[PDB]
Design a protein around this ligand. Structure first.
Ligand SMILES: C#CCN1CC[C@H](Oc2ccc(C)c(C)c2)[C@@H](O)C1
Ligand SMILES: C#CCN1CC[C@H](Oc2ccc(C)c(C)c2)[C@@H](O)C1
Ligand SMILES: C#CCN1CC[C@H](Oc2ccc(C)c(C)c2)[C@@H](O)C1
Ligand SMILES: C#CCN1CC[C@H](Oc2ccc(C)c(C)c2)[C@@H](O)C1
Ligand SMILES: [Zn+2]
Ligand SMILES: [Zn+2]
Ligand SMILES: [Zn+2]
Ligand SMILES: [Zn+2]
Lengths: 360, 360
């Protein structure tokens, strides 16, 4: 059975399981089950499933070099699919809540879940909470007798917490740290002193890399009972490195990729986000260019947003991206080589993850 | 050491642990640690700690009749306090998100967390997510080597999911089930056919009783390694019964308790909530009274809200509450007697939980 096909068939099984359990144990009625079914489909499907499929791809790599009965191969693949959906549902939780938090309009060329006429923020915040609760229901049901259940739940929790901390780093990236105070309305920074590569690296590390790369790779190892085939410090170092490049790609696209291709209108400039473009620009601009940046950043006014985009285009950030990319390619290659010592199989899965990121 | 005193000292220890870990492992800066410290204090403290203290009280009951070394007694009490804080932090998550979802103004006579000038909804939604993540960090750290960790995490997850389902039941309690649709803006019910005792019992069962009564009682049993001293079906039956009475008390207070004593202005009528008052009133009103109810319920207009309150006061719902209360007292007494068969100690803890609920 083809990988994607198996993955999508497991979604249907998981959905039927969750919805039946709501009927048999939670006294749900058909209309509320239908609402939750549509919520699940609208928030979980439509993407590329890169995170979920990485779990499956990692498990597939190990099956090719390990002796198992056919029933065990089927069990491992089914577990990798459930594991993959746990991450997809975790991401769905993040996207639903992030969209509400940011007042976002579109997500994947469709309205944000909370903007659906029969949803509203009052329901959507709770819908987002349910999405994350379902990841745990999945784990406890499907992995009840598995030796990896403990490690898997512990990893999932640590990743989820790191991601929430990352979201806090992201939402507060445009204010002066020394001014943070629940009692006082937060002014946007005027000096941009915290728009540095190391501060940018911290936001990205926590907000994206743990759930997008570390969690699918390690979950693939856990379901395969293969964590001994790797040096965990290398897995962490390669996940953070690929994850950072992925976010740099996200940041560049928000500013220059057409809204129809991106699936929404990018607002990082208006939002005064600490993006790779803002940081890199400030790392090479002259005094006059820094003044022009300060006068126009973090403003809704389309004329001010156009000035910032013009500063980025004239600063030749395309060259800085090419240099950054060459250094990442270099470091990713080094780590893949280091991973080959313990597992050529896992190194290959990482090579495929990198290829899919670099070529997207 | 006095119970409440030990409980509050454990909060300080847990807070120091979480904040230090953010510094040592999550690269947090002092200003963001301070923000999270104030968030923790504002959202977790100020209440009666009834839920957290029930865990402690249950564990204390068993210590009085069980042989242990002094170090083991200290361990059990410390675990009961951490367990109690997990529930208090779970409730803090619920209250933060519920307040945002409802557009609430005050909570415990203070502004809702999201209304703090330096917080806003953009941060508060994520702050609420962090509160729940901290319950898991607590469990994995403090109970790492405990035999009850698995059962405790499994119970906590099931309770959290039931509570989120309950919140969905609550937020949709004023619409017609057959009209629920994410694509269509939801009209408020006109017939109130779903304002029945059994539908009211379902909302209350899931939205409050699992986390307010079942979870503290069972957590007290888990930390004591005493789940064999009880018949779990009785614990579930007594928790649902006390929990329902607690919510009936909440519903009555929202309408008749002064805002200064309640800690907020009650809006159940304006919100068209399926409250015990609305259900009980519709269960005894004549055709003319039902028409007057339909014409005035679920409206912001203070004149319409005053009409509904006048219908409740003239319907003599105080007598219906007295009859309901007498039946609950009767059923709670029966279940306590049934619990005495396996554990007079646990039956006594339940007797104390009931007394604290009935006399509040
Ligand atoms: C793919 C797959 C597996 N499966 C196919 C049947 C069905 O398809 C839908 C339904 C709704 C939405 C919004 C989308 C994108 C797809 C769903 O249950 C998922
Ligand atoms: C890609 C990327 C970076 N990023 C921002 C959008 C979204 O944000 C989160 C993360 C964690 C939490 C707890 C919440 C509520 C939202 C997620 O996709 C992570
Ligand atoms: C009780 C207790 C244990 N402890 C005492 C010191 C300190 O007290 C505060 C601080 C802030 C707020 C808002 C409240 C209500 C109490 C806190 O860390 C908790
Ligand atoms: C008391 C009571 C009844 N109730 C309503 C307020 C609040 O609601 C929740 C519950 C679950 C979830 C997931 C959310 C976001 C909010 C909680 O206190 C339960
Ligand atoms: Zn965001
Ligand atoms: Zn972005
Ligand atoms: Zn509410
Ligand atoms: Zn209430």
């Amino acid at each position: 059975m083809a990988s994607m096909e198996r993955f999508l068939s497991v979604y249907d099984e998981v959905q039927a399981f969750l919805l039946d359990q709501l009927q048999s144990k939670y006294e749900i009625d058909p209309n509320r089950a239908r609402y939750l079914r549509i919520m699940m489909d609208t928030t979980c499907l439509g993407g590329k499933y890169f995170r979920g499929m990485t779990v499956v791809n990692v498990a597939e790599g190990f099956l090719a070099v390990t002796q198992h009965d056919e029933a065990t191969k089927e069990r491992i693949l089914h577990d990798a699919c459930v594991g993959g959906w746990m991450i997809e549902f975790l991401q769905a939780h993040y996207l639903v809540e992030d969209d509400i938090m940011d007042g976002s309009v579109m997500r994947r060329g469709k309205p944000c879940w909370y903007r659906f006429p029969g949803v509203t923020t009052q329901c959507a915040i709770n819908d987002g909470i349910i999405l994350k609760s379902w990841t745990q229901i999945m784990a406890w049901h499907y992995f009840a007798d598995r030796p990896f259940l403990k490690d898997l739940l512990c990893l999932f929790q640590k990743v989820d917490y790191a991601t929430a901390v990352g979201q806090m780093y992201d939402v507060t990236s445009m204010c002066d740290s020394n001014k943070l105070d629940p009692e006082v309305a937060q002014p946007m920074t005027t000096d941009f002193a915290e728009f540095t590569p190391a501060i940018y690296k911290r936001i990205v590390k926590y907000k994206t890399t743990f759930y997008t790369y570390l969690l699918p790779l390690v979950m693939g190892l856990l379901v395969s009972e293969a964590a001994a085939s790797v040096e965990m410090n290398l897995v962490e170092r390669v996940a953070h490195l690929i994850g950072e490049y992925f976010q740099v790609q996200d940041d560049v696209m928000d500013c220059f990729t057409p809204p129809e291709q991106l699936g929404k209108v990018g607002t990082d400039i208006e939002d005064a986000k600490c993006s790779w473009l803002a940081v890199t620009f400030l790392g090479k601009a002259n005094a006059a260019q820094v003044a022009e940046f300060k006068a126009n950043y973090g403003e809704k006014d389309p004329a001010k947003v156009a000035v910032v985009k013009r500063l980025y285009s004239k600063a030749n950030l395309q060259a800085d991206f090419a240099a950054y990319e060459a250094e990442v390619v270099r470091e990713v290659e080094s780590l893949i080589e280091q991973l080959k010592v313990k597992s050529p199989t896992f190194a290959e899965s990482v090579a495929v993850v990198w290829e899919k990121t670099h070529k997207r």
